[model samples]
Target: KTLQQIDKLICSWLKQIDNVIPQLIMEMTTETKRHRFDLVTNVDKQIQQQFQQFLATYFPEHQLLAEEKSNAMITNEINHLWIMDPIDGTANLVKQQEDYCIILAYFYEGKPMLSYVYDYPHKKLYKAIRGEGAFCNGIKMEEPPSLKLEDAIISFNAQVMNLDTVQDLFDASFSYRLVGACGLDSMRVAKGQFGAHINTNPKPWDIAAQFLFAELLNLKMTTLDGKAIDHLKGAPFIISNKACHETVLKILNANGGYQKYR
Candidate 1:
């Protein structure tokens, strides 16, 4: 099926969130995963299951790489893949009841085709199709202006905020913002609200949608050292407006890009 066709179906499927979250949030349960700081809740698993079923029915041949249950290492040989983070900010959902989102990316033979970042609480859906354009709730988005390090706002995953590289970048930018959600932070970058977003450790599901967003918005997305990114195999990355990309890379490389600390 075409990317647009799949996007339409996904839009319809997302409507269920309006009912599910309101009804479940009050009685939701959580579980710890991997470590004390990492968490998962019933809503996260439920959203993952719902999307998995939608994919199985509409595109049975495709494989899924998702957060909750299917966290598999992706290889280049796969043809059709759907990468998803059902709930990008589980902690925010459990604690603040806002600032969370669902991220989905469709890869056809390793190339990004279509992507979606749905901020359910705010009812905003950001989506893009390869070589076409990007939209927020179906309204086309204009490309954000290129900005310099000293003039733009930036964001880093909270865990990386203490790194020397992060400190340098933060000091140089207008200010820094941490949304506790990669997808939500990325949506801001794509929409021009943020000048850039850097994540030292991100999974495929966490950064997938930004690939299509970069293509559609004429933004830059690359490794911290300004190299090409392997979409299926997540790594340290930065998505920035064109003008500030090199400055961001310089700071990261000057500090050896997490190597000094590791």
Candidate 2:
């Protein structure tokens, strides 16, 4: 019911998860099915299950929308929703042993209540409570100055950015980047470190928490077609800073995003 309660619980959970990271990093089991490029791991499933079950017992009234191996759709129930992305970049976690994060969001009445994006390796925890502003590493974060496309560095989710819309980015922005992690890239955008990050096919948990950050930062989150996103029905979308959102949206619309290339 209150932000303090959930924040305390989350911190405890994070410590518990980190305690096991030492063991998890060494002997992780991995596999692939529908798409070899898209990976799922034993650790990922276990973490999600463990977190969800814990939340179920501790907060029985809250419902979970957790990310998993196969795709699943979510509902705009407007009820108590705890959207959890247990381990956002499993591959990055498995290989680089860094650049991954845990992004979770709590929603009620179809609006975000609180959110967190923890870059576990770098020890940067970015969090926000609706209307309370945002913070990183327990310090209040300041809003970044507005930046235009020509002076920005774009974070491209290359798997989906493989189009004229993308080619347009490389040519328009100062440069482009693909960090291989949604939360990490989203954090970058929220921090004003990157102009924008595009996720072509993200699940509810993947985008839910980022949406909260954007709302607080007064940034942008919209479909590839430059329309408002239905959080339940995930689609190709952009997580961008305020200044770039307008400029970037124009390019996507001009090229018709992914539609015109075909």
Candidate 3:
């Protein structure tokens, strides 16, 4: 009953936020980068404030962690916590006006309970509830069939692949895409639009919802080192339909050793 209530509340909020994304998208400009190659928009801060306010009012005492505010509140408390990326893919949202997302996930005691990712331009919503299947725009999604490496469509971060040692590993893939939004890119793989999605520097908000959605859909997810991803730490990682995951891992392992950088 509690979970149901939470679901209804989150779903309602998502629908309301859906109506605002287009307006936010319209307000973006190319002059919004926070650093060289990294982008942020006024809408990112506005929507984050709105979502944080809503959480404070309705779920007071539930810790909130977000891409923009992680250092302020990501805590060790194991109870209910809300993780959000008010706008993912801000670069594309600003420059090309395509393929961005709003991501939210609820974690209880370090485990994902529910997640939602709103693909703003396409207005496609991907959601999942723990122990239940994943869904896209209210329709259940099936696990992608097993596929060989040569038969896969993958997503990769070109920045990370720039390292010469691992360039051959990336090139060995059938094909790869760099969609700019981690949430949307991962969602595409989880929904069978691609075979794998690789992210090298994903923060919690960037991967939380999509990670849980992928798991619920039976997709294989792992760190670049082939270790299981722990939600608390940001790392280099990959997610893919089960069959192609091992092949990608083997390629990465053989070319360049994965190491922790802190």
Best by TM-score: 1
Name the candidate that leads on lDDT: 1
Give the Cα lDDT of each candidate.
0.85, 0.79, 0.78
Q: What TM-score against the true fold does each predicted structure earn?
A: 0.93, 0.91, 0.90
- In candidate 1, stretches whose alpha carbon ends up further than 4 angstroms from where it belongs are 72-74, 161-163, 255-262
lDDT, candidate 3, 29-87, per-residue tens = 44544577787787788789888889889988788788766466466665988788888
Taking the candidates one at a time, how many backbone clashes does each contain?
Answer: 0, 0, 0
Candidate 2's C-alpha runs over 4 A off are 69-78, 259-262
The better candidate by TM-score, 2 or 3, is: 2
Find the number of clashing residue pairs for candidate 1.
0
Put down candidate 1 lDDT per residue, 136-250, tens digits, no spaces: 9999998998788789889886465446766787788999888989999888788788888888888888998999899889899998868888877788899998888888788
Q: What digit string (tens of lDDT, one per residue) describes model 2 on residues 1-262?
A: 4787787788778778877766776778888746976677777778888888887789887877777734343454648878888888888977887888887888888788788888889877888877677889778776677878888899866545437777887788988887778888888888788998887778777788887788878788998777888776578888987888878777766744544334
Poorest lDDT segment (10 consecutive residues) of candidate 3:
253-262
TM-score of 2: 0.91
Which residue pairs in candidate 2 collide? none
